[PDB]
Amino acid sequence: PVSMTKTSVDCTMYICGDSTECSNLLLQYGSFCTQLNRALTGIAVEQD
Amino acid sequence: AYTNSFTRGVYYPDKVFRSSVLHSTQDLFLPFFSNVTWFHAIHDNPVLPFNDGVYFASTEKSNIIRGWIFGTTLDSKTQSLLIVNNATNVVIKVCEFQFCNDPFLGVNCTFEYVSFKNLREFVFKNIDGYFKIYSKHTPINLVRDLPQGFSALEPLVDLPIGINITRFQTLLALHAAYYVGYLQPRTFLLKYNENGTITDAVDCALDPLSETKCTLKSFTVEKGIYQTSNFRVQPTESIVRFPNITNLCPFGEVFNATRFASVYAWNRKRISNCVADYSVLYNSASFSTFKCYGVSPTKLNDLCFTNVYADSFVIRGDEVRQIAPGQTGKIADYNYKLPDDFTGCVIAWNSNNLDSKVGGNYNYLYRLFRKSNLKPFERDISTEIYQAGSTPCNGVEGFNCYFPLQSYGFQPTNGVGYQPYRVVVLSFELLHAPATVCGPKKSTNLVKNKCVNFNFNGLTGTGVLTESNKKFLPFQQFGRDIADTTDAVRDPQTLEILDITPCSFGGVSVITPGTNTSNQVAVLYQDVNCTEVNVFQTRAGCLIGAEHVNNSYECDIPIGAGICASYQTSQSIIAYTMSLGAENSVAYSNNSIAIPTNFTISVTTEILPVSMTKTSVDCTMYICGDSTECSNLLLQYGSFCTQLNRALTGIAVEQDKNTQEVFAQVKQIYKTPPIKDFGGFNFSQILPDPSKPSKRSFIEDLLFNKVTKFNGLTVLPPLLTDEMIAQYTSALLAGTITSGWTFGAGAALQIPFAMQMAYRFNGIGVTQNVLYENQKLIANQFNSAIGKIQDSLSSTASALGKLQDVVNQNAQALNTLVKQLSSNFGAISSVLNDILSRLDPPEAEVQIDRLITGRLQSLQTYVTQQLIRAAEIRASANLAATKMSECVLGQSKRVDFCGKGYHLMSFPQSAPHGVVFLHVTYVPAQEKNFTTAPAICHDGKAHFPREGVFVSNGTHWFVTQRNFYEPQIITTDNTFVSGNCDVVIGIVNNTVYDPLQPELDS
């Protein structure tokens, strides 16, 4: 295997999809969405 | 009259000093380069919407504009402020002043305070009751309109009025040029300088440039692809689909029955074919207590449940808290037990008057004695006499004989907690029965191929509703997927299978070149079909902004599905099928050979992250910095942070081990000779310069120059400082300049650099004779190639990509740790001295525990992230150690392992937490077509070369090495005799000249 499936799983919509209140409570955790999205993006560009 | 609001309107969201740091906040500013209205001051004061604010600017020469009135009615009906400056006093009052018929200044008194060449900007506003006076006076040389320039707008005075303003009217002076920008709750990338003046700002929700600007946290964005947010097709309307129920449900019957059951025999009234509004329930104010455990106490009317139970039984006032999960007592253990996962809602209204006889209500029973505690939602009708003592009864009294059921005497003369009630615990359940009890919300038509807000029988979501062929059985109602989410539903009014699929969604990514190159904007909608959104549709999605090009180019900013975007010609953004290269068919046949007549020595900079900043956090200092209570509460987790400290110190020691394995493979001190008579190969740019104060290379100096805390986490200094890392690199360079591969294995053997290149040439199967034949030429090419390294390494910032990105990666890891010191994690504050200094210790274990589980989980993500990052660094560092061992400390025969081309050697160069290798490679340049045959037959015997390839230019046959055209006549010290000419295909007639033949003939 040279690559996995290039999953681009977004933090806010995966955890609180189609929701504003849950995304507001989730951004109160600080950066976990931005380093998780950067981690998935780094994974995707790593398969590329 | 419209104006481009160029740069004006930036103020301080807060007045906390910051330096060389970019803070992002949500606040009310007007957008940059936006549309603002242009006014004159001849013969205009309409009441504009100050919905959340505007920005004022004045071109003034005689002080005509002098005041403002802001408010919601602005007619002394509400509290409205007036501003006058009578050349000596500043007067800002909201008191009941006499305003004129047309409000001007000449040329509810609760707030108890009673007393061109100039651009004036004033923003009077209210945020949370603060009245901020924002002021700035700025000289200019400009007359046409508002100037282009940056101006921080600072607060001066905060006054206690706290006034609603939704629309405002300017104040004139009778015997006003201004601008109106509608502010929005937008997020803003703000820049502070070291002197504390806000020098720039970005409204970053405006255009793709600014969206990249505040997602990359920088005012200058590199050319590339960046995901900024998510695109979701918003529902345009709401569809409600409920069964065609026509009967009002007897909820009022189980509230207003002539009699209610006891807790000994409470009823299960099961409900189907009903409409439940609950609006009459909430409109009734009779509820004494409403402890609604599974579902919201207020938000229930729109919700639909599958089945409901009315568990009506009468119990005392002090016992109303015992109808709860986890509660115990006589009633909770002997009469009615609720499960710990009870999903429902408990009802009890103020009801002393109805289920209470004036002579005593005697018909309600309860169980006070039982040998075992009862089960959740079971019904026990058993009347067996409870066994208390020792001897049994044959229906008599005495020992072991009381009736286990006895009744309440309900009289109005009882105590206030002992009062009778019509408590009726409507034991709601959310199960997955056929959903019947829905709020009315009259239905609408079934839309197709358009995602809207649907609520099918209490099940909500977003998606399109299409017809399906999915053959339901008549009892079955809902569909599920492999991921057990809802796949199909049946419309409960018309019996049709409705497929549910959420519409096209996805993150938005942005194509943008450098801001130092362009400001042209582009957006990408991936996996969206170009209906629901100079528009291009591809397999990757809907691309808006770039014109589609049938001509194919090399990929610069990747898009997806083979599409790539770039910036070219007059320049513009283009979209195209990306090239896989130049379309170059090879000139194959059975007899076609290509061998290069010319070569070049190319040098490639394989730069490798070998090491990392030895970050080490402290259980005390980082997690619970200078706090005895928090350090104790972290040791409450036991050895947990101790293996974290062990792991981080392990990362430090193995980083030292990586550096030792790549550099201190050398056992001695090697120093360069005072003369650099290196056979034409000047190394004073790659070798340390004695004229330099620190003995490092010149290219290392540009690797130190062009490419380059105290708050609980420290950095450990390396065991190897930068100067003596440079000393080890100088040692490795010296060993591979005067000693080559020998000092890697054993004793230092002095070997010339000409010998190293000549023998390294042999390694890749090209003969070393070419090197001494063109020594001056390749000295020129290699020196100028190192000069091209110097030029590229000094000109392009992208040449340091693989170390700049990793040093930045560690920087963002540390920076996210730093940002968790702002993150609250559910605690009310993020600074630990603040949270400890204001919380009493018993609730401080709770607050500190939330903060440290958040801090420790973020630190856990951090330490695992650098554990896998140090695994990547250590994999690339064992790669670097084998690279140095086989490519510096020896010659590698691994093709394409030491950069593109036939590897010759490599030159270590120290760099900030990394190694730069100067891999010299052999790359062929110019080639010719020749005719070739597998073998040459000479005297009935087939001939094969020991080294090299048979070729012919069409006139004479030659044997030549596979990577350089050196034609010689076929000679038996280059070929050998084998086999016969009758078997091999493609063999040609020739003669093979034995070098022994002229010796024996002469």
Ligand SMILES: *[C@@H]1O[C@H](CO)[C@@H](O)[C@H](O)[C@H]1NC(C)=O
């Ligand atoms: C900020 O303050 C320093 C300190 O006097 C001053 O020298 C400088 O000119 C100011 N302005 C800047 C850095 O733009």
Ligand SMILES: *[C@@H]1O[C@H](CO)[C@@H](O)[C@H](O)[C@H]1NC(C)=O
């Ligand atoms: C109830 O809904 C069904 C939908 O199929 C419809 O055919 C029927 O006429 C409706 N009846 C009333 C009284 O609204």
Ligand SMILES: *[C@@H]1O[C@H](CO)[C@@H](O)[C@H](O)[C@H]1NC(C)=O
């Ligand atoms: C995109 O929408 C058009 C509009 O009708 C349609 O013809 C085309 O099939 C769609 N593309 C895909 C991949 O379904």
Ligand SMILES: *[C@@H]1O[C@H](CO)[C@@H](O)[C@H](O)[C@H]1NC(C)=O
């Ligand atoms: C082959 O091409 C290289 C390219 O620079 C040149 O330096 C060299 O002199 C050429 N050799 C011959 C034999 O033409």
Ligand SMILES: *[C@@H]1O[C@H](CO)[C@@H](O)[C@H](O)[C@H]1NC(C)=O
């Ligand atoms: C050193 O390298 C420079 C290249 O800038 C060259 O001009 C000079 O002749 C070299 N000196 C020696 C002694 O090789």
Ligand SMILES: *[C@@H]1O[C@H](CO)[C@@H](O)[C@H](O)[C@H]1NC(C)=O
């Ligand atoms: C394949 O090789 C044979 C023998 O060298 C030759 O006769 C034949 O023409 C070749 N095929 C082509 C397409 O040239």
Ligand SMILES: *[C@@H]1O[C@H](CO)[C@@H](O)[C@H](O)[C@H]1NC(C)=O
């Ligand atoms: C030359 O090659 C041919 C095959 O094409 C072979 O039959 C013959 O014996 C060879 N030698 C000669 C003609 O001397």
